[PDB]
Amino acid sequence: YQQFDNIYLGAEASVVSCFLQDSEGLIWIGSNKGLFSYDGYSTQQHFTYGENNNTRIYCGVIIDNTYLYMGTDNGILVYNYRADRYEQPETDFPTDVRTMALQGDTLWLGALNGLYTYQLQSRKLTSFDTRRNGLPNNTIYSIIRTKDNQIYVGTYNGLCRYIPSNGKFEGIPLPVHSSQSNLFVNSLLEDTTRQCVWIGTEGYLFQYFPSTGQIKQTEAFHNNSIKSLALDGNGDLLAGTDNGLYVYHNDTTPLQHIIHDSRNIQSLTNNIIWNIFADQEHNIWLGTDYGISLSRYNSLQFIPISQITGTGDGNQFYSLFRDSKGFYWFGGANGLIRFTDPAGERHDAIWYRMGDKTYPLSHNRIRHIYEDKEQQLWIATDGSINRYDYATRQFIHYNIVDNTGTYNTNWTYYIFEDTAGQLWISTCLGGIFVVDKHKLMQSTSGQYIAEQNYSVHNGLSGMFINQIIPDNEGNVWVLLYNNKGIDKINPRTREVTKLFADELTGEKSPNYLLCDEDGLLWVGFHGGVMRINPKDESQSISFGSFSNNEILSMTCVKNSIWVSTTNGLWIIDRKTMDARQQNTNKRFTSLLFDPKEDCVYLGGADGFGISHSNLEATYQPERPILLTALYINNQLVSPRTRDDVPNIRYTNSIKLKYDQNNLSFELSDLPYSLDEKNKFVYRLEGMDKEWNFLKSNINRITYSNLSYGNYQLIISKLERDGQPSNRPHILNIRILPPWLEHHHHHH
């Protein structure tokens, strides 16, 4: 938290008391003069001077996914952010609202002179006081609602909890201080992980634990006041005070104390922090007595599987693959998911697994995915091998046996096709089978007797074999479970030969195998890898103090090989074998390099990561482009001031008047998290014959003197190879001729 990007609203609106982020990402700011928004590039006010809405905002909450409810001297402003209109409900709200908290469909309202509930359907306003309900005081400064559906209320003179069984309030006996003549509870935060409620008062930061009743005094800030609380992306507690920001990690870690430097423009804007907010990308917004200080969060993108199909089911990913047709195939402990646009909005995901009514599999446990020489897709599972039928969108299961018993294919670990149309199948218990691919495909039944089998009776060091990998000169190399060295099969002569058993033994017992694009084998063991020329050689490196280990997954990425490990991730150059370790604390059991989109998928527990081929640095998620301001004849226009203009943010098509033909436009992909802004191009179909390029600091498109007719403004993000996007934001624009005025847009 050494640096900030500071944002200001104007000389009048120096004081920021709260933030909200709408479901679609736009940040809203409550200021001493009213509501603003900020789109990453500039601020925008949503209030007119002198009006009831040109007022100080104390607090805020989003209702019905369309309204901002704001606390105010004169009660509650309801702003419809989609309509861009103030829509006042008939209710006579109490005045001096300081804090709001949603509980189901009932809004708690804390005010300078009462506690209330507002039922959003019936609009029933119910009041709670000292005499009738046992509140310690009628002046409410904070209310929160915990995940276990309890309601905490912090007043001018103490903290309490609601007892719904009987309408009363139960005190939580925070210490009473000699220096104090009343007990301000200013701020309250639930902490799921530490399982407490944080409490901010004058001088003291408490941790209340519901589980046992304990009230821990975590810090004592002599002559400070704690005004705000939040948890950051690292799980750390952030405390806003009247003398800067304090950060808490744990009892043995020193606090961080961050304060304004009047000589440094990147320092915390001001030492009085009225509100902290963690936005949905974990960036920290600080609201102060002079401006906003944004602390950007900085990370890989990690996509939980619910984003692909949600569905909150789990999966531990062990095989990741992209087929020639484009489909992503992510399989593991709990079946195999097919989908497109890793993210991307829509995925039309299908999840194949044991027992699904529509999309079944012989077994959930996926061990390998593979596309063959004819673009046909095979998976290896603990219910034998399956082939996909893209036509039916269903898998076809096969049973394979050797000419005798047992030796079957139920537990298939690895699969590939050779250059002579045969399918190579590695197995647990059953050795390696080689099968005519077309004749198993053409098979009626059973149960198919394999053409050959490699055993241990006539070759092989064991029958418990993970990977089997082929050679630039035709040989098949076999990785074996709990064995010394690797076996090489010569499929012409059938000569099996154990090799490198001198080195790959004991605490170097091998457990991973891959061939790279140059023909060389890479073997993974506990604490290192070894590179083999299969013919004209026969060599090793190590990770050092770590050790323990071990190797969860390996894949080639350009002239590197990425190795994923219990500890972390290692990138090893393929020529020098020099290794470098990276830095989340996530462990990854799966790796796929996608050379087309130049990125690497990292598969793991209930999700997957994405990073560029050069992990320097982050893989930014795709962000839709918003229009965030329309100007006609240079004035900024919107439904709030005009019956004849729509909310540009939620408009695809617009009909303007003959003389509403000098237009400006402001664009944003909400770059709050970014150091550098993204670049854009833009064109006006019906006028421009080519793309126009915007300087990155400039997000205003402007067109003058348009004749009547139809146009399309198309905006596109410059993709990371200089090329425009093929998913632009498109605004249809029609300028109406003088005699068709009446089709001007209305309401």
DSSP string, 147-175: TTS-EEEEETTEEEEEETTTTEEEEE---
Same-domain check for residues 484 and 622: no
Among candidate residues 475, 514, 505, the one with its CA nearest the CA of residue 493: 475
The answer to whether the CB of 469 falls within 8 A of the CB of 476 is yes
Alpha-carbon distance of 707 to 661, in angstroms, equals 7
Q: What are 291's two structure tokens?
A: 């401006």
Point out residues after which the chain has a gap (C–N over 2.5 Å): 299, 538, 583
The answer to whether the CB of 320 falls within 8 A of the CB of 591 is yes
Alpha-carbon distance of 203 to 201, in angstroms, equals 6
Residue with tokens 């006041």: 225
Q: Write 344-348 long-range contacts (CB < 8 A, 24+).
A: 344/622, 347/308, 347/309
The answer to whether the CB of 284 falls within 8 A of the CB of 297 is yes
Same-domain check for residues 591 and 471: yes
Cα 33 to the center of its chain, rounded Å: 34
Same-domain check for residues 183 and 260: yes
Same-domain check for residues 177 and 304: no
Among candidate residues 35, 37, 27, 29, the one with its CA nearest the CA of residue 52: 35
Residue with tokens 């190590």: 542
Of 283, 299, 315, the residue that ends a domain is 299
Q: What is the CATH number of the domain that holds 732?
A: 2.60.40.10
Among candidate residues 527, 422, 523, the one with its CA nearest the CA of residue 479: 523
The answer to whether the CB of 269 falls within 8 A of the CB of 288 is yes
Alpha-carbon distance of 614 to 414, in angstroms, equals 29
Same-domain check for residues 211 and 352: no
**Beta-carbon neighbour count of residue 477 at 10 Å?**
20
Alpha-carbon distance of 655 to 665, in angstroms, equals 15
Same-domain check for residues 503 and 606: yes
Q: Which residues pair with 142 in a beta bridge?
A: 154
Residues 6+ apart with CB under 8 A from 472: 519, 534
In order, the DSSP letters of 599-659 are EEEEEEBTEEEEEESS-SS--PPP---EEEEEEETTEEE-TTT-TT---GGG-SEEEE-TT
Which strands, in side-by-side order, build the sheet including 366-371? 366-371, 377-381, 385-389, 394-398
Which strands, in side-by-side order, build the sheet including 158-163? 140-145, 151-155, 158-163, 168-172
Same-domain check for residues 96 and 84: yes
Alpha-carbon distance of 603 to 609, in angstroms, equals 6
Residues 6+ apart with CB under 8 A from 654: 646, 648, 731, 732, 733, 734, 745
Q: Which letter, b or e, does each residue of 367-385 get, where b requires 16 or more Cβ atoms within 10 Å of its Cβ?
A: bbbbbbeeebbbbbbbbbb
Q: Which residues pair with 553 in a beta bridge?
A: 564
* Cis bond upstream, residue 87 (ω within 30): no
Of 299, 326, 343, the residue that ends a domain is 299
* Cis bond upstream, residue 406 (ω within 30): yes
Alpha-carbon distance of 453 to 345, in angstroms, equals 46
Dihedral-angle region of residue 559 (phi above 0 means left; psi in -120 to 50 means alpha; beta otherwise): alpha
Q: What is the CATH number of the domain that holds 328?
A: 2.130.10.10
Which strands, in side-by-side order, build the sheet including 422-427? 412-417, 422-427, 432-436, 452-454
**Beta-carbon neighbour count of residue 668 at 10 Å?**
25
Alpha-carbon distance of 262 to 424, in angstroms, equals 71
Cα 491 to the center of its chain, rounded Å: 48
Alpha-carbon distance of 620 to 300, in angstroms, equals 9
Among candidate residues 396, 405, 393, 392, the one with its CA nearest the CA of residue 431: 405
Total domains in the fold of the chain: 3
Same-domain check for residues 273 and 336: no
* Resolution, angstroms, 1 dp: 2.8
Elucidated via: X-ray
* Cis bond upstream, residue 548 (ω within 30): yes
Alpha-carbon distance of 39 to 25, in angstroms, equals 9
Total residue count of the chain as it appears in this document = 747
Q: What are 87's two structure tokens?
A: 């829509």
Same-domain check for residues 430 and 497: yes
The answer to whether the CB of 453 falls within 8 A of the CB of 433 is yes
The answer to whether the CB of 213 falls within 8 A of the CB of 196 is no
Q: Can you say whether the dihedral through the CA atoms of 268, 269, 275, 280 is positive or negative?
A: negative
- Alpha-carbon separation of residue 203 from 157, 173, 176, 180 (angstroms): 14, 16, 12, 10
The answer to whether the CB of 315 falls within 8 A of the CB of 333 is yes
Dihedral-angle region of residue 718 (phi above 0 means left; psi in -120 to 50 means alpha; beta otherwise): beta
Among candidate residues 243, 241, 245, 227, the one with its CA nearest the CA of residue 284: 245
Same-domain check for residues 257 and 391: no
State the residue range of the domain holding 343. 300-615
SS (H, E, C) 437-486: HHHHHCCCCCCEECCEEECCCCCCCCCEEEEEEECCCCCEEEEECCCCCE
Of 273, 299, 325, the residue that ends a domain is 299
Same-domain check for residues 334 and 404: yes
Q: What are 364's two structure tokens?
A: 């959930």
Q: What are 741's two structure tokens?
A: 């005025």
Dihedrals phi, psi of 506, to nearest 5 degrees: 65, -120
- For residue 133, the 8-state DSSP code is H
Same-domain check for residues 73 and 32: yes
Alpha-carbon distance of 240 to 259, in angstroms, equals 11
Q: Which residues pair with 206 in a beta bridge?
A: 199, 217
